[PDB]
C-alpha cells in the first residue's frame, strides 16, 4: 500500500495506491506504420529517457493564486531529455505528470490540476503581442495573479480567466484531477501526444500546459507551518525522434 | 504511400484554358470586324505550348467551349428594345470552305458543322475527334513539307485541326452590339509518346523552334555556398 | 427517451452563414473597387468563431455559395440596354497566383479554379476539400511560426484555405454596374477533437486570443436570493 516505483536505474518515488487519469482515454504509445509522413525511422531512446524528473517544490501559501508550466519546455535542462531536445529535429512524447502535496490533517484547501492542450495565451496589453520570456520559464513555475496585470509584452495573468479568456471553472473540460486536502493527497495525469502533425519540433511548439489553481484557499491556525509544498514529477513516455544533427538552436 | 493520379497525362494535359479572346461587332463598316476567326493551333499560347512540348507525338479529341458576352455600343441611334442575340459558331473541318467575310455562302455550307446559340443560357460546347491522316499529331517535325526538301521547315504538316468562325445571325439595323468571344480549349483522351526536355529559352514565334542562347540556370554566390546560415540563437548557437 | 441528432457535430457546425459582404463596380477609376477579395478564414465573424473555438482540431470540406445581385448606377451616360452580366469567381489555391487588380494574368491562370456565372439563374456553388499539409486545421496554436521561436505567435500556421476573387467578365464601356457579393460558407463532414471551454471575454482582433478581464458571470441580489417569490394568492397563500 506504500508501493515504490522505480523507473530507470536512477529514480525512486514512494506513493500509495490512488486514482489516475488517463488522457483523453488513450495510453501513450509508439508510432505505427500508417501514421507518419517522415522519410526515416524513429530510433526511440527508450533505454535512457524514461525516468522521473522531480522539479523544484512550490510553496502553496495562503495568498497564492496559481501556477503554470508549459511543456515540453519544462524539461529543457532536465538531463538527457533536454539533450534530445537539442540534438534532434522532430519529437513526440507522452508524459505522466504526478502531483502531490504534503499537508497535515489540520490544513485545508483544494487544488485543480489541469493539462490544457494548446493553451495559447493572450497578452496583458491589447493591440500587442507576447514574448517567449513571459510565456514560461525553463524549469520554474509562472504565477497567476489575483489582480490585473498591466505590462506591455506580458501575459494577462489574472486568475479567473486562466490566461486564455475563459471561465476558470470550465477548465474541468480538459484532463484534470482535484487535490482536496481533506481526502485526497496526490494527483497523477497521463497525457498522450496531441498534435495535428505526427511529429513537431519541440522548441517552437508548446504541446500542453499544466495548470495548478487553488479554488478553496489554504487555511491553517497559528501552530501550523504556513505553506504546503506541492511537488510535481514528470516522467516522459514513449519518446521518439528524427533528424540527428548538432544543437542548431540554443 | 501516396497516389500518383495527379500527374497522369490525362490530369496534366486536360485542363480548360482560355486560348483566344476576340471581339466582333454587329453593324457595317469594314467587312472584317463583323466576325471572329481562330485557326486551331496549340502554339500561340506559350503556357499550354510548353506543356504540349514535353512530348513529341500527341493524340487527343478536342472539347471547345465558347463564352460569348455582348454589350450595347454607345453613340446615337441606340439599340433600345433589342430582342435577343443569336450567334453562329462554325467549325470548318480541315480543307473546308472558309468565309471571306460576313453574309457569305460558306456560313450556309452544310459541310461545315455549326452551332446556333441564343444569349442568356449555358455556353455553347462542341467536341471534335482526332482528325488526321496520320496516326498522331506531332509537336516537332525535323523535316520539310515538299518531297524535294523545299518550302518551310515543318509548317505544312498534317497537324491541321481546322478553324472556328463566329458571327451574329441577327440582321440588326439600328444600334450596334459588340460581342466578345472566349475560347476554352481542352484535350480529352490524351495519349502522348517520346518525352522531350522542358524548354529553357523563351519563344519568339508560333511557327518555329527559334531561340536566343540562355543560361542553363540562375546565378549563385559560389561553387559551395549554402544560403543564410542561422544566426546564433539559444538552440542553434 | 428523446433523440440527440440535433446536437451532433455535423448538425452543430454545418449551417450556411453569411461571412463576407463586399461590393465591386464595373467601370474604371481606382483599380481596387473593380473586384472583390476574401481570404478564407473563420475568425473575422465572431458568431461562427465561437462555435469553431469549442474545439482544438477541426477537419472539414468547404461548401461556398455566392449570392450576387447587381444594380445600375445613377448619373449620366446610363447603362440603357445592358445585355446580361457574367461574373468570374476565382479560388486561388493556397500558394497560388493572386490578382493585383482587374485585367491581370492571374485571372487567366489555369491553376486557379474559376466559375463563370450568368445573372438570372441559380447561384454559383463550389466545394473545396481538406487542403492542408497537416492532418487537421488548428483553431489554437501555442507556438511560433519559425523554428527559432521568432515571428508571430501563431499566424503563419498551415491553416491556409486560400482566397476568393470575384470580378465582372464584361467589357462595359457606357454605364457602371455595381454588384454585391454574399458568401455563404458551410463546412461539410466536420470531425472535431479536444473540446475547449466556451469563451467568456469578447474578441478584439482576428489574429489573436487577446482579451480584457471580464466577470465570471452576471450580478445577483445575494448569496442566497431566489427571485420574485409568488405574492399571496388563493392557492399559493
Amino acid at each position, epitope marked *: 500500500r506504500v508501493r515504490s516505483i522505480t523507473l530507470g536505474n536512477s529514480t525512486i518515488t514512494t506513493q500509495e495506491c490512488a486514482n489516475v487519469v488517463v488522457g483523453y482515454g488513450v495510453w501513450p504509445s509508439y508510432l505505427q506504420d500508417n501514421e507518419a509522413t517522415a522519410e526515416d525511422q524513429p530510433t526511440q531512446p527508450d533505454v535512457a529517457t524514461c525516468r522521473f524528473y522531480t522539479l523544484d517544490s512550490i510553496q502553496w501559501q495562503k495568498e497564492s493564486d496559481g501556477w503554470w508550466w508549459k511543456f515540453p519546455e519544462a524539461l529543457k535542462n532536465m538531463g538527457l531529455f533536454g539533450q534530445n531536445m537539442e540534438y534532434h529535429y522532430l519529437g513526440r512524447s507522452g508524459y505522466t505528470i504526478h502531483v502531490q502535496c504534503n499537508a497535515s490533517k489540520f490544513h485545508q484547501g483544494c487544488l485543480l490540476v489541469v493539462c490544457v492542450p494548446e493553451a495559447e495565451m493572450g497578452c496583458s496589453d491589447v493591440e500587442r503581442e507576447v514574448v517567449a520570456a513571459s510565456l514560461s520559464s525553463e524549469d520554474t513555475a509562472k504565477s497567476f495573479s489575483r489582480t490585473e496585470s498591466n505590462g506591455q509584452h506580458t501575459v494577462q495573468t489574472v486568475v479567473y480567466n486562466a490566461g486564455m479568456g475563459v471561465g476558470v471553472g470550465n477548465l474541468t473540460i480538459f484532463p484534470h484531477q482535484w487535490i482536496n486536502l481533506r481526502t485526497n493527497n496526490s494527483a497523477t495525469i497521463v497525457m498522450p501526444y496531441i498534435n495535428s502533425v505526427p511529429m513537431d519540433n519541440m522548441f517552437r511548439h508548446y504541446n500542453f500546459t499544466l495548470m495548478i489553481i487553488p479554488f478553496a484557499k489554504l487555511e491553517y491556525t497559528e501552530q501550523a507551518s504556513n505553506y504546503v509544498p506541492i511537488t510535481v514529477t514528470v516522467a516522459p513516455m514513449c519518446a521518439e525522434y528524427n533528424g540527428l544533427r548538432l544543437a542548431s538552436h*540554443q | 504511400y501516396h497516389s500518383r493520379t495527379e500527374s497522369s497525362i490525362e490530369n496534366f494535359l486536360c485542363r480548360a484554358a482560355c486560348v483566344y479572346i476576340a471581339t466582333y461587332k454587329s453593324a457595317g463598316g469594314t467587312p472584317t470586324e463583323r466576325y471572329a476567326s481562330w485557326r486551331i493551333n496549340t502554339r500561340q499560347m506559350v503556357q499550354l505550348r510548353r506543356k504540349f512540348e514535353l512530348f513529341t507525338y500527341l493524340r487527343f479529341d478536342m472539347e471547345i467551349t465558347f463564352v460569348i458576352t455582348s454589350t450595347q455600343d454607345p453613340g446615337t441611334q441606340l439599340a433600345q428594345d433589342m430582342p435577343v442575340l443569336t450567334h453562329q459558331i462554325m467549325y470548318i473541318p480541315p480543307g473546308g470552305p472558309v468565309p471571306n467575310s460576313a453574309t457569305d455562302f460558306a456560313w450556309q455550307s452544310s459541310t461545315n458543322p455549326s452551332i446556333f446559340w441564343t444569349e442568356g443560357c449555358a455556353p455553347a460546347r462542341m467536341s471534335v475527334p482526332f482528325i488526321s491522316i496520320g496516326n498522331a499529331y506531332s509537336n516537332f517535325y525535323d523535316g520539310w513539307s515538299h518531297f524535294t526538301q523545299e518550302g518551310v521547315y515543318g509548317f505544312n504538316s498534317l497537324n491541321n485541326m481546322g478553324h472556328i468562325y463566329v458571327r451574329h445571325v441577327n440582321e440588326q439595323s439600328l444600334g450596334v452590339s459588340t460581342s466578345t468571344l472566349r475560347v476554352y480549349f481542352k484535350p480529352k483522351h490524351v495519349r502522348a509518346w517520346v518525352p522531350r526536355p522542358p524548354r529553357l529559352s523563351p519563344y519568339v514565334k508560333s511557327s518555329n523552334v527559334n531561340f536566343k542562347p540562355t543560361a542553363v540556370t540562375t546565378e549563385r554566390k559560389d561553387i559551395n555556398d549554402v544560403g543564410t546560415l542561422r544566426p546564433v540563437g539559444y538552440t542553434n548557437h | 427517451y428523446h433523440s440527440r441528432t440535433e446536437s451532433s457535430i455535423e448538425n452543430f457546425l454545418c449551417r450556411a452563414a453569411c461571412v463576407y459582404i463586399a461590393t465591386y463596380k464595373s467601370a474604371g477609376g481606382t483599380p481596387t473597387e473593380r473586384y472583390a477579395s476574401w481570404r478564407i478564414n473563420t475568425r473575422q465573424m465572431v458568431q461562427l468563431r465561437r462555435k469553431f473555438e469549442l474545439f482544438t482540431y477541426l477537419r472539414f470540406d468547404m461548401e461556398i455559395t455566392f449570392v450576387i445581385t447587381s444594380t445600375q448606377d445613377p448619373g449620366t451616360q446610363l447603362a440603357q440596354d445592358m445585355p446580361v452580366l457574367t461574373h468570374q469567381i476565382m479560388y486561388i489555391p493556397p500558394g497560388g497566383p493572386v490578382p493585383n487588380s482587374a485585367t491581370d494574368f492571374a485571372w487567366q491562370s489555369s491553376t486557379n479554379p474559376s466559375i463563370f456565372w450568368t445573372e438570372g439563374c441559380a447561384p454559383a456553388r463550389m466545394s473545396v476539400p481538406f487542403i492542408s499539409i497537416g492532418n487537421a486545421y488548428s483553431n489554437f496554436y501555442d507556438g511560433w511560426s519559425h523554428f527559432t521561436q521568432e515571428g508571430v505567435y501563431g499566424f503563419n500556421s498551415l491553416n491556409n484555405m486560400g482566397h476568393i476573387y470575384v470580378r465582372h467578365v464584361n467589357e462595359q464601356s457606357l454605364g457602371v454596374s455595381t454588384s454585391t457579393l454574399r458568401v455563404y460558407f458551410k463546412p461539410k463532414h466536420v470531425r472535431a477533437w479536444v473540446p475547449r471551454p466556451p469563451r467568456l471575454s469578447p474578441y478584439v482582433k482576428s489574429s489573436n486570443v487577446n482579451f480584457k478581464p471580464t466577470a465570471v458571470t452576471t450580478e445577483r441580489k445575494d448569496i442566497n436570493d431566489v427571485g420574485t417569490l409568488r405574492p399571496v394568492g388563493y392557492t399559493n397563500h
Partner: antibody
Amino acid sequence: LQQSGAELARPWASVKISCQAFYTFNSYGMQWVKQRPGQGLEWIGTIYPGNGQTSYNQRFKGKATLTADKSPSTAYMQLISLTSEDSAGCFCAVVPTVDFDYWGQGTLVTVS
Amino acid sequence: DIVMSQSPSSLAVSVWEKVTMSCKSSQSLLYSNTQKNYLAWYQQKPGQSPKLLIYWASTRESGVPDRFTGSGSGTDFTLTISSVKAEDLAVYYCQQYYSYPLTFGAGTKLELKR
C-alpha cells in the same frame, strides 16, 4: 561586474584572468575580448554555461583556454607562451543571445 | 569569417555638425525569422572601456541621446549623430551578432576640431 587586478607576467609563460558575474550563469555565455590600442577589438572566445559549450576564435585556438565552474560562479581565461604581442587589455562581457551588453574594466596584461 | 568595414576610419568635426558613419558588412546580418538585424554599436571613450550605443541595430539604451541612433538594414548601416556635443570625441566600433567569430569593425575615431 569585476576583473583581475593589474599583474606583471614573464614571456613564454601563462596568465590566468578572472571575471566575476553577479547574474546567474544560465541561458547565456561569457564573452572574452582582447583590445589593441593601435587597432580595434578582437574576440577571443565565449564559454556558454547554459548548455556548457566552450569555443574559441581560430586565431586563439591553442592560445586561450576558457573555463567556468558552478559554485565559485567566476569565469576564467588562461593564455600561455606569452609574448609582447599579448600585452593588451582583456575584457569579459555577457551575452543573453540578445546583445553583447556591457564589459567593464580589466587588468592591462603587461608582458615584461 | 564575417568582416565589418568602417568608413570613414576617422573624421574631425566641430560643434553642432550632424555627422554620420557607415559600417558595411561582408554578409547581410539580417535573418528571416524575426527580421532583426544583428548589429551592435559601441562607444569607447578616450582611455575608457566601451559602452553600448545601439542593440538590434535599431534600439537605444538608457542614458543615451537621440544623437546616437541606429539606421539601416541588410549589409549596410550607419549611426546618425544629429547634434554633436563635447562627449562624442572618442572611437566607435560596430559589431555583429551573426557569425560566431564575433569580429568588430575597423573603428571610427570621431575626432574633435577646435
